[PDB]
């Protein structure tokens, strides 16, 4: 369920700021709340679902 | 000085005034001759400044010679000696000096002058008790006068009389005329201005054509053969800063064309004499030979018009008419107190009894460089006409009649700034046999 919460947080971050967001900012903001492996897992599940897409490497935006 | 956008105006191109069949003109032969005209004289033939100075010197020497010749005609003048020869004669012998006037000073016991002739300069003292003290009180500078008195070795000429070149007290009566002929004098039309009276001028043109209300006026119109204009026929351009906003026709060619269109309704049997003025397209200084032909052509082609100079002398049935624009009246008023505008006859009397149209130099009348002086009244006339004052008046002095034609322009702002109240639309009527004004017409009610 922690993965689902992480996915919800990742979705919340991108909605508030309607622009492309770097990966480093997401990693820092999520930070101690979830370890890096879970962050990457959430990112790959979101890209598999198709909610978000990456224009460039290291940059993600809402889709 | 800012000039705005163009405007559309009229040139009086559709004005036609006909002749009444009731008035049948009387058949009178015409006797008009131009006795004097500036363009009739021929002037006799190197740094520019030297030639200009010589021209001015010759001008003043010619004035002195002519006015001396006029003075010597008085029988009471005798034993005239030159100023440079004053030391030869004794200190108790009566002598008479003739010369120009340089400076006049009023002291507590008399008048002190500085009189200059071609040979020297002397200082004169006129005692207060002298009978001819008021005449010396009004003499303008640059006028030729005479003094009669003794000379002291101290260097002062103590005079007891003062003379001026005047009009003789007696003149022979001219022979009569078989038929009666009238003449009309007008001036200062100022065509092209905002204050120009149009309806008054149209009513005037309808008066010359036989539309009259009274039988006596019907008698007068049938006997009119001459019309004379003296100066300011058009308003001009560039006279003073702020004139474009005060113009209806702001172009010189169309101004003269409009004047020609208005004047074409003058009846055929009437002959017109037109002369230049201050505002017209002519010479900046007086005397003025004529209008510029290339600018004032439309008034040259009228079949009953004669262009004359400023000044000129016209002989009508044996009677001499002196016609000048009359800018020298302003210099008299400034000098002598008690003579103001609205009574321009008295300054005219002063100018006539000095026998010079514009004596003072460096005042407010410009004098052109010329080897000979042409503003001297060489022969006593029968009638003198002037303008430039915009107020009507007429006086008689020793058999001559002096008339100041009025204006056709209403009160401008510049006049109400300096407090001059003009009299518009007044026309003198003169009789050739007597050279006197018999009636004054009033068209001022219309505009």
């Amino acid at each position: 369920e922690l993965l689902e919460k992480a996915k919800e947080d990742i979705l919340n971050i991108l909605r508030q700021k309607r622009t492309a967001i770097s990966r480093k900012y997401i990693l820092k903001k999520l930070g101690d709340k979830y370890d890096e492996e879970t962050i990457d897992d959430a990112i790959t599940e979101l890209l598999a679902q198709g909610e978000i897409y990456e224009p460039e490497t290291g940059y993600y935006k809402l889709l | 000085e800012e000039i705005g956008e163009e405007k559309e105006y009229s040139k009086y191109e559709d004005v036609v005034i006909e002749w009444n069949p009731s008035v049948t003109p009387v058949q009178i032969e015409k006797n008009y001759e131009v006795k004097f005209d500036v363009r009739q004289v021929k002037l006799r033939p190197g740094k520019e400044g030297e030639i200009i100075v010589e021209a001015y010197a010759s001008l003043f020497k010619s004035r002195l010679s002519k006015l001396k010749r006029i003075l010597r005609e008085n029988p009471e003048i005798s034993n005239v000696v030159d100023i440079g020869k004053l030391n030869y004669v004794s200190g108790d012998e009566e002598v008479t000096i003739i010369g120009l006037v340089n400076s006049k000073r009023e002291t507590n016991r008399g008048l002190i002058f500085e009189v200059e002739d071609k040979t020297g300069i002397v200082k004169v003292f006129l005692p207060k008790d002298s009978e001819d003290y008021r005449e010396a009180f009004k003499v303008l500078p640059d006028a030729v006068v005479a003094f009669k008195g003794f000379y002291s070795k101290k260097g002062i000429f103590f005079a007891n009389k003062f003379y001026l070149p005047d009009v003789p007290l007696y003149r022979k009566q001219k022979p009569p005329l078989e038929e009666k002929v009238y003449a009309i004098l007008i001036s200062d039309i100022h065509v092209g201005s905002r204050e120009f009276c149009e309806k008054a001028f149209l009513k005037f043109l309808e008066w010359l054509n036989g539309h009259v209300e009274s039988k006596e006026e019907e008698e007068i119109v049938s006997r009119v053969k001459y019309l004379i204009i003296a100066g300011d026929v058009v308003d001009g351009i560039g006279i003073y800063p702020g004139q474009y906003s005060d113009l209806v026709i702001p172009d010189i060619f169309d101004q003269y064309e409009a004047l020609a269109n208005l004047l074409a309704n003058v009846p055929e049997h009437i002959t017109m004499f037109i002369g230049p003025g201050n505002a017209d397209a002519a010479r900046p200084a007086i005397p003025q030979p004529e209008f510029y032909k290339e600018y004032a052509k439309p008034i040259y082609k009228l079949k009953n018009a004669i262009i004359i100079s400023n000044p000129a002398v016209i002989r009508l049935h044996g009677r001499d008419f002196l016609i000048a624009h009359g800018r020298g009246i302003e210099d008299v008023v400034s000098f002598v107190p008690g003579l103001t505008h609205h009574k321009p006859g008295l300054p005219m009397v002063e100018l006539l009894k000095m026998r010079h149209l514009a004596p003072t130099f460096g005042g407010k009348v410009p004098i052109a460089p010329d080897p000979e002086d042409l503003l001297v009244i060489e022969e006593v006339p029968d009638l003198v006409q002037m303008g430039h004052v915009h107020v009507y008046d007429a006086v008689v002095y020793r058999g001559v009649q002096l008339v100041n034609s009025a204006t056709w322009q209403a009160q401008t702002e510049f006049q109400k700034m300096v407090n001059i109240v003009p009299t518009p639309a007044k026309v003198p009527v003169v009789d050739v046999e007597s050279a006197r004004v018999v009636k004054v017409l009033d068209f001022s009610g219309w505009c």
Partner: protein, 1182 residues
């Protein structure tokens, strides 16, 4: 006050130098060779001391100092007046004396003791009675000529003080008749018509309203010889026109009514209701379409500056027309007070009509301004002779491509400060888009998105820079350099586009073209042309497609090439093709979406609105606001000479000739009868104009003469006899008409100072002072040897234009860091130690930067002073200067022509321009601003040695422009009101820029931008001032104007009209008519009128005759008589007028006037001197 350590040390060092000068000055004067035995320039340190030493009464300084801190300097004047009336400062005598003293002291306190109004402007104070009305007493104030240069604010305060004094003395009001009011109404209009154009011309109703209520009379003595219609008015002694009184009435109470109302309200004066009442009675659509309309309605074009055009002074921009001067808000290092800042490239491309220090007649903010080079701002855009378009932002590029310039599409930028808008109460104009706005948007976007805090123009922390660089994937060094200097460091186009896409900010202002200068239909046609007939090369940058090159044929483009020129797009013409280069192809094709969406014109929309409606990257307007200007009064830097040059103040009469040469009179051995004072030796009885006896060596005593009996009395007897002759009972005089032998005096002086090789020595025809004391001839000999000149008081002066400066670099003024450390400078403006010549150092209040010409003249003056000290006084030398660089660290005195108080400065460097650089506080202390004013500098020791009160003219105005008291400390609280509006912030905030679009008055933004006024009282008003725009060099650009190399009028007019033709925002046809109506026709007509009413002159003598002599020669001399107004004067301007009429399209009125003038000039001279042309065609058409 408790100042920091640096400021107190600086002031103490200045005081030590002043004391060092004063010691030598005191030693020299005590020998007895001079008019007095003590130095005649006292020193004061505040307003109270100056007031005590200028107008008195004695003992007032302590009371002023006590009362100022308690009430606030406006109630203090009233308290001082009350105390003086009560007699606390002694018994003055009659009531008139009390009134005069009180009025002078109060006006001096309110004016701060600098302006010479209380000394010379006010002549008398008298009591008079209303004989016609009620026989009641009233107070009257008499004014002199000097009141005309005392300023508007000093004139009204005089009326206020007079009213208060008359109220305190228990007097009554002034009750005028109708004749008085009518005479005043006539007099004001007559003065305006005849002698001088008043700046503010009141209506007759306003004049009557003022005359009906002012409780005190405003009269004076006659200044001009012009008569008036209303004459013999009771209570007025002169029939001639009075100038000072009417200028006071027109300019103090009426023009400056609001300031007087404010003073009345703050002080508490009652009875001034009418002035307050008079003051209060006196006062479906696109975004940019609406903004333009509202701007046009609320702010209207002003054409007052362009009314008059003078030949040789060009017009650079039409009123509020695109293509003129762009408006940029800011303040440079060397501008801000009233000074504009322009790029030096603009100066070159206008044919150097503009040089550093040239005055400009400006439209919007104020009336006048001075130019100063700024390199950071943009420059002109030009079109070459082969069709290419270039951008010129460098001095070298302008120097290189000047000869190939065909059209100036845009002039450039102007830097105008916010303080000027506050001072002139000018409504804010919409701001153009610039780099400082963009950087603020950049940092705000970073803060909102990534929560990283950065500050422009400063040094940010390293970790924040690294974090931002990681987020944005750019080089941290580049980001640091861009944030530190956003004006000079700009990103490439691909970074600008990436920033716009990622961060959401608009496009960089550098890459934005003038899109709103073309109608949407032109862009619509250009879109199809580019889509069909253009070949474009593309490139990719991080997934963003941008153009690289555009090539299109000229024949297919057609008339769309003008759209590119109006857009300001650089391009070249080659082989019949138009090529657009790298950075500008992207600038043109990116705001259009790379031709993906079609551009269609629609009503009630602008180009930028259509772009922003359907494009991802937004833009902002770059050319919304424009300002026009005109040239006047070129820069000045030159020494001062009296109208005939004078080297010694010694009377010679006509014995020396026109040049008044004492040496020439000495060679011929002439005897001159002049009016001079002598002295008598107590022991041997020698009588001579010198002070020390040539035989004994003892000081002599002045001789007083009786005008009737001609008796000589020494000083002791004259003092004992109370300066009255016992026999005649008449007042004695110190001077008499006497005969002297110049040869003996000159030989004795030459033997005295061992100077023999002098060829010329010029004096004066007659002394003006009442004492008529002559200056020693040895001083004149030394001045002639060193080639220097003397003023009326006895000093040597240098006059130059004044410009402001606050920060400087050592390399600009040619001074090493070691010399600066010796001068007291230790840190730069950011707080770091001074180690390099490229750093920026703040300028101390009383340090000045001179010019090369000033140094060259002051070196001669220093040599003269050293020679004087060594030979005349027998004292060691002081300056010991061999080059102008040896004057660094020495002291001068600044003085203004309309004041009588000086301020001490110190030299620290030199520049090549013809200006005088100083702190704004320094110029404010002389009551001047930097909009074309000229001030004077003189060496301190020379003034101390040579200045004497005995040399001053007797008539009113002789104490004006003289160092009666100098000031040794500078206090910003008591300098001037204008400097308090100056802004001292480093950068303007976003609120200002966003508030510009709402067209707000500047008073609503005073709390946002810090100004000098907010620091008054605190120790922070002496240091910490800052600037917005930097500059590479303050003396870069042309030095001398082109107006000084042109002699003939025709050449002037030709160059002026060429400049008018080149500039796109100037109508040359309109300029052609302005010259004819303002400079040429008036002169022609005036000369033609004056020719026939002139005077005549002789060549040997100078006699004037009102009519030519008959014989053609001078009656006395026999010499030649010559004209005064010649034919050359009439015809000097005819050819130029004919050229203007024949070439340019002017109105018919002017053509006919010029043709008639030609005909009149030709016709006037007919008797004396017996083809496709404009006149012939004009007269042949009709």
């Amino acid at each position: 006050m408790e100042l920091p350590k640096e400021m107190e040390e600086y002031f103490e060092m200045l005081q030590r130098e002043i004391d060092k000068a004063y010691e030598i000055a005191k030693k020299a004067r005590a020998q007895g060779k001079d008019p007095s035995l003590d130095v005649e320039i006292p020193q004061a340190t505040d307003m109270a001391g100056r007031v005590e030493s200028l107008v008195g009464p004695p003992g007032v300084a302590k009371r002023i100092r006590e009362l100022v801190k308690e009430y606030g300097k406006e109630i203090a004047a009233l308290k001082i007046v009350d105390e003086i009336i009560e007699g606390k400062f002694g018994d003055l005598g009659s009531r008139e004396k009390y009134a005069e003293q009180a009025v002078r002291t109060a006006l001096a306190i309110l004016t701060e003791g600098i302006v010479s109004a209380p000394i010379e402007g006010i002549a008398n104070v008298k009591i008079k009675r209303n004989t016609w009305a009620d026989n009641s007493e009233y107070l009257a104030l008499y004014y002199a000529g000097p009141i005309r240069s005392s300023g508007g604010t000093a004139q009204a305060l005089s009326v206020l003080v007079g009213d208060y004094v008359r109220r305190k003395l228990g007097l009554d009001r002034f009750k005028p008749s109708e004749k008085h009011i009518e005479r005043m109404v006539e007099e004001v209009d007559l003065y305006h018509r005849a002698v001088t154009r008043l700046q503010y011309h009141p209506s007759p109703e306003e004049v009557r309203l003022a005359m009906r209520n002012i409780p005190i009379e405003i009269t004076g003595e006659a200044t001009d010889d012009v008569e008036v219609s209303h004459r013999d008015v009771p209570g007025v002694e002169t029939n001639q026109l009075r100038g000072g009184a009417i200028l006071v009435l027109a300019e103090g109470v009426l023009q400056k009514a609001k300031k007087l109302v404010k003073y009345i309200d703050k002080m508490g004066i009652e009875g001034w209701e009418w002035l307050k009442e008079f003051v209060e009675a006196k006062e479906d659509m696109g975004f940019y379409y609406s903004l333009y309309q509202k701007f046009k309605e609320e702010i209207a074009p002003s054409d007052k500056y362009a009314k008059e055009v003078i030949g040789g002074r060009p017009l650079f921009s039409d009123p509020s027309k695109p293509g003129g001067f762009r408006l940029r808000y800011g303040r440079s290092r060397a501008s801000g007070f009233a000074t504009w800042g322009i790029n030096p490239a603009t100066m070159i491309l206008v044919d150097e009509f503009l040089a550093i220090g040239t005055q400009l007649k400006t439209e919007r903010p104020g009336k006048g301004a001075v130019v100063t080079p700024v390199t950071t701002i943009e420059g002109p855009i030009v079109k070459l002779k082969d069709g290419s378009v270039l951008r010129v932002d460098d001095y070298n590029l302008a120097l290189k491509v000047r000869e190939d310039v065909e059209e100036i599409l845009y002039l450039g930028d102007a830097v105008i400060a916010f303080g000027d808008f506050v001072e002139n109460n000018q409504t804010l104009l919409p701001a153009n888009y610039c780099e400082e706005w963009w950087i603020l948007e950049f940092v705000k976007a970073l803060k909102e998105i990534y929560e990283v805090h950065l500050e422009p123009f400063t040094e940010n922390e390293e970790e924040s820079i690294e974090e931002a660089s990681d987020y944005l994937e750019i080089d941290p060094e580049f980001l640091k350099e861009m944030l530190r200097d956003p004006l000079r460091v700009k990103p490439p186009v691909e970074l600008a586009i990436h920033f716009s896409e990622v961060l959401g900010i608009p496009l960089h202002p550098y890459y934005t073209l003038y899109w709103n200068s073309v109608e949407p239909k032109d862009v619509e046609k250009l879109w199809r042309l580019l889509k069909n007939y253009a070949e474009i090369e593309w490139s990719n940058f991080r997934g963003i497609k941008f153009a690289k090159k555009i090539v299109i044929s000229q024949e297919k483009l057609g008339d769309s090439k003008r759209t590119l020129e109006l857009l300001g797009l650089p391009h070249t013409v080659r082989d019949g093709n138009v090529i657009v280069d790298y950075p500008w192809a992207a600038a043109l094709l990116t705001p259009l979406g790379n031709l993906n969406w079609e551009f269609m014109a629609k009503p009630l929309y602008a180009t930028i609105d259509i772009i922003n409606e359907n494009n991802e990257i937004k833009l902002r307007d770059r050319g919304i606001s424009w300002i026009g200007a005109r040239m006047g009064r070129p820069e000045k830097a030159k020494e001062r000479k009296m109208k005939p040059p004078v080297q010694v103040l010694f009377p010679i009469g006509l014995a020396g000739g026109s040049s008044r040469d004492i040496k020439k009179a000495a060679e011929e051995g002439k005897v001159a009868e002049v009016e001079i004072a002598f002295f008598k030796c107590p022991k041997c009885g020698h009588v001579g104009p010198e002070h020390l006896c040539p035989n004994c060596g003892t000081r002599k005593e002045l001789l007083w003469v009786c005008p009737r009996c001609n008796a000589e009395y020494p000083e002791s007897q004259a003092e004992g006899y109370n300066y009255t002759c016992p026999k005649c009972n008449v007042k004695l005089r110190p001077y008499a008409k006497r005969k002297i032998r110049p040869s003996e005096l000159l030989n004795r002086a030459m033997e005295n100072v061992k100077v023999y090789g002098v060829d010329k020595l010029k004096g004066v025809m007659g002394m003006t002072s009442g004492w008529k004391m002559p200056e020693p001839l040895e001083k004149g000999l030394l001045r002639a040897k060193n080639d220097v000149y003397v003023f009326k008081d006895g000093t040597i002066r240098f006059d130059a234009t004044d410009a402001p400066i606050t920060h400087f670099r050592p390399r600009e003024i040619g001074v090493s860091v070691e010399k600066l450390r010796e001068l007291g400078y230790t840190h730069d403006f950011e707080g770091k130690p001074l180690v390099s010549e490229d750093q920026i150092v703040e300028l101390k209040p009383q340090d000045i930067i001179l010019s090369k010409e000033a140094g060259r003249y002051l070196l001669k003056v220093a040599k003269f002073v050293d020679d004087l000290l060594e030979k005349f006084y027998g004292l060691p030398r002081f300056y010991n200067a061999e080059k102008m660089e040896d004057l660094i660290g020495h002291l001068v005195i600044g003085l203004a022509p309309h004041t009588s108080a000086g301020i001490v400065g110190r030299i620290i460097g030199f520049v090549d321009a013809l200006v005088g650089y100083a702190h704004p506080y320094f110029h404010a202390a002389k009551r001047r601003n930097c909009d074309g004013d000229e001030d004077a500098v003189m060496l301190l020791l020379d003034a101390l040695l040579n200045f004497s009160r005995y040399y001053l003219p007797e008539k009113r105005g002789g104490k004006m422009d003289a160092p009666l008291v100098i000031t040794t400390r500078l206090d910003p609280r008591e300098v001037d009101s204008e400097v308090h509006n100056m802004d001292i912030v480093r950068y303007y905030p976003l609120e200002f820029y966003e508030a510009t679009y709402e067209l707000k008055s500047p008073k609503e933004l005073v709390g946002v931008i810090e100004r000098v006024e907010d620091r008054l009282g605190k120790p922070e008003m002496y240091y910490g001032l800052k600037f917005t725009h930097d500059t590479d060099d303050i003396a870069l650009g042309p030095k001398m104007s082109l107006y000084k190399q042109l002699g003939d009028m025709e050449e002037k007019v030709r160059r002026q009209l060429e400049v008018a033709k080149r500039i796109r925002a100037v109508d040359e046809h309109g300029v052609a008519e302005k010259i004819l109506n303002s400079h040429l026709i008036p002169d022609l007509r005036g000369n033609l009128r004056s020719f026939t009413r002139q005077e005549f002159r002789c060549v040997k003598c100078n006699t004037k005759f009102r009519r030519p002599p008959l014989n053609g020669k001078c009656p006395v001399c026999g010499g030649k008589i010559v004209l005064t107004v010649s034919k050359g004067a009439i015809e000097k301007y005819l050819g130029t007028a004919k050229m203007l009429v024949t070439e340019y399209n002017v109105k018919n009125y002017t053509r006919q006037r010029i043709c008639l003038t030609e005909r009149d000039i030709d016709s006037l001279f007919e008797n004396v001197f017996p083809p496709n042309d404009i006149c012939q065609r004009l007269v042949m058409a009709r």
